[PDB]
Amino acid sequence: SGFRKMAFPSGKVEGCMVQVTCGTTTLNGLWLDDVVYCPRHVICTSEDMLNPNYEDLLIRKSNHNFLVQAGNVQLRVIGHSMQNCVLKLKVDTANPKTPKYKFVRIQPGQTFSVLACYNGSPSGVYQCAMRPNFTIKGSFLNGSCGSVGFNIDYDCVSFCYMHHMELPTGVHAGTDLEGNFYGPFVDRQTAQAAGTDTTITVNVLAWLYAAVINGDRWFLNRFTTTLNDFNLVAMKYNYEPLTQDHVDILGPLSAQTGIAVLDMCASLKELLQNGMNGRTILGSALLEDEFTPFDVVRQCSGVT
Amino acid sequence: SGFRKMAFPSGKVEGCMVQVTCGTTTLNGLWLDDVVYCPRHVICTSEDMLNPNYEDLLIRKSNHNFLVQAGNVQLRVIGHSMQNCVLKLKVDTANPKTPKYKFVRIQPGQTFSVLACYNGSPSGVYQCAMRPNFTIKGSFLNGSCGSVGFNIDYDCVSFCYMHHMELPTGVHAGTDLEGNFYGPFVDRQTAQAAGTDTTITVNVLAWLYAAVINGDRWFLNRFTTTLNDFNLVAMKYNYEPLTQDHVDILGPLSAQTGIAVLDMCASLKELLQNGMNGRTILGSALLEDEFTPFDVVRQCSGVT
Ligand SMILES: CN(C)c1ccc(N(Cc2ccsc2)C(=O)Cc2cncc3ccccc23)cc1
Ligand SMILES: CN(C)c1ccc(N(Cc2ccsc2)C(=O)Cc2cncc3ccccc23)cc1
Numbered sequence: 001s002g003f004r005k006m007a008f009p010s011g012k013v014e015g016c017m018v019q020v021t022c023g024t025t026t027l028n029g030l031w032l033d034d035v036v037y038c039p040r041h042v043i044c045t046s047e048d049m050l051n052p053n054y055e056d057l058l059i060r061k062s063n064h065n066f067l068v069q070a071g072n073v074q075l076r077v078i079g080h081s082m083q084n085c086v087l088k089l090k091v092d093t094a095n096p097k098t099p100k101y102k103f104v105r106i107q108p109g110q111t112f113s114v115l116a117c118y119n120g121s122p123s124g125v126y127q128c129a130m131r132p133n134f135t136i137k138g139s140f141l142n143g144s145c146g147s148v149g150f151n152i153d154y155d156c157v158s159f160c161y162m163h164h165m166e167l168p169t170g171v172h173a174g175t176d177l178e179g180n181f182y183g184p185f186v187d188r189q190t191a192q193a194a195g196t197d198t199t200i201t202v203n204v205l206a207w208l209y210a211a212v213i214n215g216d217r218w219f220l221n222r223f224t225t226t227l228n229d230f231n232l233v234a235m236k237y238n239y240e241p242l243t244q245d246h247v248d249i250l251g252p253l254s255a256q257t258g259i260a261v262l263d264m265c266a267s268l269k270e271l272l273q274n275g276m277n278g279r280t281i282l283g284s285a286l287l288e289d290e291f292t293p294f295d296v297v298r299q300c301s302g303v304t
Numbered sequence: 305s306g307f308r309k310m311a312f313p314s315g316k317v318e319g320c321m322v323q324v325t326c327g328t329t330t331l332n333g334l335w336l337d338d339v340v341y342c343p344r345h346v347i348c349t350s351e352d353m354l355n356p357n358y359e360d361l362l363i364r365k366s367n368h369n370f371l372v373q374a375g376n377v378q379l380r381v382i383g384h385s386m387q388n389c390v391l392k393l394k395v396d397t398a399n400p401k402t403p404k405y406k407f408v409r410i411q412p413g414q415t416f417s418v419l420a421c422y423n424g425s426p427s428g429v430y431q432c433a434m435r436p437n438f439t440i441k442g443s444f445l446n447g448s449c450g451s452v453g454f455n456i457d458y459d460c461v462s463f464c465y466m467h468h469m470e471l472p473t474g475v476h477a478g479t480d481l482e483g484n485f486y487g488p489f490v491d492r493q494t495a496q497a498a499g500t501d502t503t504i505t506v507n508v509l510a511w512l513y514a515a516v517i518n519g520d521r522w523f524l525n526r527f528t529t530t531l532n533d534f535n536l537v538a539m540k541y542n543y544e545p546l547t548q549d550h551v552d553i554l555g556p557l558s559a560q561t562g563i564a565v566l567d568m569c570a571s572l573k574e575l576l577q578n579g580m581n582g583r584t585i586l587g588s589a590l591l592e593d594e595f596t597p598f599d600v601v602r603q604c605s606g607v608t
Contacts, residue, residue, distance in 0.1 A: 001474045004443040006428035009419060011315035115313060121608035124310035125429055137587065139308040141606045170305045170519055215474055276589070278579070283441065285580070285589030302445045304425035 003214045003282045005290060006299055007113035007127040008152040015097030018075065019120030020089070020146065021067040028117040028146025029068060029089070030159070030177070032098050036068050036075065036089040037177060038146045039164045040082055041187050049189040058082055063089075069120060070095070084179025085164060085187050099157050103177040106160040108132045109200040109240070111292050112149040114161070116140065129203065129290040132240060133195040134183025135171040136161070148177075167192055200289040201239045202246040205264055207288045209253035210296040211281045218279060220259070223266040230265040237272045249293045256300075307518045307586045309594060310603055311417035311431040312456040319401030322379065323424030324393070324450065325371040332421040332450025333372060333393070334463070334481070336402050340372050340379065340393040341481060342450045343468045344386055345491050353493040362386055367393075373424060374399070388483025389468060389491050403461050407481040410464040412436045413504040413544070415596050416453040418465070420444065433507065433594040436544060437499040438487025439475040440465070452481075471496055504593040505543045506550040509568055511592045513557035514600040515585045522583060524563070527570040534569040541576045553597045560604075 020029040020038045024045060029038035041049065043057045061080070066089050068075040079090030106112060111129045115122050116139060128136055128149075140147070140163060149161025164174045164187055171194060173185040185192055212220065225233075231241050247261045254261050268287075276285055291299075324333040324342045328349060333342035345353065347361045365384070370393050372379040383394030410416060415433045419426050420443060432440055432453075444451070444467060453465025468478045468491055475498060477489040489496055516524065529537075535545050551565045558565050572591075580589055595603075 001445075001470060002441060002443040002476065004430040004432070005309060006420070006430045006443060007311060009315075009318050009426035009429050010313045011318040011426070014313050014315040116310070118606045118608045122313035122315070123606060123608040124603070125313050126308040126310045128308070137306060139306040139310060139603060141305075141604075143606065166305060172306065275582070280590065283590075286584065286587075299428070299443060300445075302422045302427060302447065304422045304427040 001214050003210050003299065005127045007125045008150065010113065010115045010122065010125045012099040012152065012155075012157050013115045013148065013150055014122050015099070016095060017115070017117050017120050017122060019069040021069075022061060022065055026119060027143060028120055030146065030148055030162070031068075031070060031075070031091070031095040032101055034091050034094045036091055037162065038087050038089070039162060039175075039187070040085050040087045040179070041145065041164065042066075042087060051188055051190075054082065058087075071120075082179075085175050085181060086162065086177070086179030100155050102156060102158045104151075104158045104160050105176045105180070106130050108134055109203060109292070111290060111295055112151050112160050114138055114149050114163075115147060116144055117147045118143045127290065129200065130161075130182060131171075131197050132200065133197040134185075135167070135173055135194050135197070138163070138172040140166055140172055149174075167194060169194060199237070199239045199287065201234055201242050201268075202249060203289040203292050204239070204287050205242075205246075205250055205261070205268055206253060206293040206296045207282070207291045208264055208268060209250070209257055209259070209293075210291065210300060212257045212259060213296075213300050214282060216281050219267050219271055219281060221267050221270055223270065224260070224263050225266040225269055226262065227265075230262070230269055233269045233272055239272070252297055253293055305518050307514050307603065309431045311429045312454065314417065314419045314426065314429045316403040316456065316459075316461050317419045317452065317454055318426050319403070320399060321419070321421050321424050321426060323373040325373075326365060326369055330423060331447060332424055334450065334452055334466070335372075335374060335379070335395070335399040336405055338395050338398045340395055341466065342391050342393070343466060343479075343491070344389050344391045344483070345449065345468065346370075346391060355492055355494075358386065362391075375424075386483075389479050389485060390466065390481070390483030404459050406460060406462045408455075408462045408464050409480045409484070410434050412438055413507060413596070415594060415599055416455050416464050418442055418453050418467075419451060420448055421451045422447045431594065433504065434465075434486060435475075435501050436504065437501040438489075439471070439477055439498050439501070442467070442476040444470055444476055453478075471498060473498060503541070503543045503591065505538055505546050505572075506553060507593040507596050508543070508591050509546075509550075509554055509565070509572055510557060510597040510600045511586070511595045512568055512572060513554070513561055513563070513597075514595065514604060516561045516563060517604050518586060520585050523571050523575055523585060525571050525574055527574065528564070528567050529570040529573055530566065531569075534566070534573055537573045537576055543576070556601055557597055
């Protein structure tokens, strides 16, 4: 028992982290096979970041200008190319620590672990969710660019995120591993509207099932609701509309606890309408949405 | 910016995790040099756990009865000994992945990362605090025994905890790496009083400094207090008494924000007396105490 914001063990990703220096800019890179992936803004200086002409800046750079350090040893850059907002530096040595990996584009509402790095060295690991507005409320300082988000299924690491930028609002933005930004963001130091965010209803409900599994049952009530009545409450409280697919993904948690999904919905409805009343659920005084139904079953079953 | 419950990157600890099977019991072990450390209850069966005679149970066991698997390869056990509540299985092969390490006894209120493992395989990593009553509110299922808690200073891993038991209350108990239980607990399946817990005042104050650093300032007020007046409030709200040493450990955060420690104390006093009023601080609707002053400066500076 016990329920925590658990991240995947970062070991397989730590072995892929390198330092990438171009000119006076240093950030992190992801060494997989004979390719180091890093944010393309490594080629910029502070003067460039207002509106960088990346194609032009990259043309002034050659293979020898990209310094790649993997711990204390230097990697030999034999090629370079830009793909969307990432640079792919081809190196003459495949990473011996390359795990089985995949490049995935995650959906908003899904979670992943972040391995925050500085100068190609890992500082820490935390679990977070891709917000419905495609931002991440991470913990990132200057030089954290190039840190990646991932999920691990057995021995296969699915890289989903690469860190590029902190918006003036303090929230974070980045790309998939093909360099495509999540959300409407661009890699320019400019005011960028993040868009209206919502709470991930399915994840809150999944977390409500984890609370019942782990002992917390005070919020359970004698009521039920319909998807329609629930969605009217979800609308008023800026919660994502709940669909039959969300009810289906909650099937296992519903079967384990014997609490019908619409019965759990009615409990969430009462919590939205009345608050916690000074009470807690799994050590939180607010409704948590950073745990997916899969994360709950994984943590409550013990998959390694 | 951004503030998260960040755990240390678990890589160096993952490389030390092995599976230890004795009879019909399987749990995790920590392979450092030519020694595998595991909870001594590996020698028990369900029938034994009510009141095990560990000296007697161990006498029926020989080196060949302790099966130690490091991934897919078997380790050869050449010696065995009990030290407090841990078994030390001497093996004929030093772990090639042994990092620079230390065995430390942590103080209550300090934090550490936990690498939850099952069958010698890591499932996840989370950050937690040693409660003032020496329990840990972890996330542990059956077979998680042998999972360790640690801190990492550069390349040196300081092992502080080993998991042994979940109390009937759902909280966790374990030992230092010399097998000494933290708190009054014994490795017997019996009702065990955990003792009165308190909130880690210094850590709450440290977290209040992290909130100001990361943008959250609504709780700052026009008041100040004394250690005496604050301690009267801390008493009423089951908070640890604040001492001059705690004020001294908060010196750096006070210097960075320019907010005097007693001024921050007066803000915490108002939050204790009036609650959050439906507001949040760093994404939490309650007062967080799982971040030490050192954790705050580390996360807000970027140490790797
Ligand atoms: C000097 N240098 C080239 C540089 C300089 C700044 C950045 N930018 C701006 C920007 C614009 C468009 S794309 C990035 C970042 O946003 C980098 C960054 C990320 N995360 C957390 C941060 C906290 C504090 C400062 C910077 C942070 C990238 C690069
Ligand atoms: C069968 N076997 C030998 C066994 C069987 C049970 C345990 N115990 C009891 C106990 C008594 C004294 S020392 C341990 C544990 O407490 C083990 C444990 C730990 N963490 C989370 C758990 C969740 C569910 C079930 C067990 C959990 C240890 C060993």
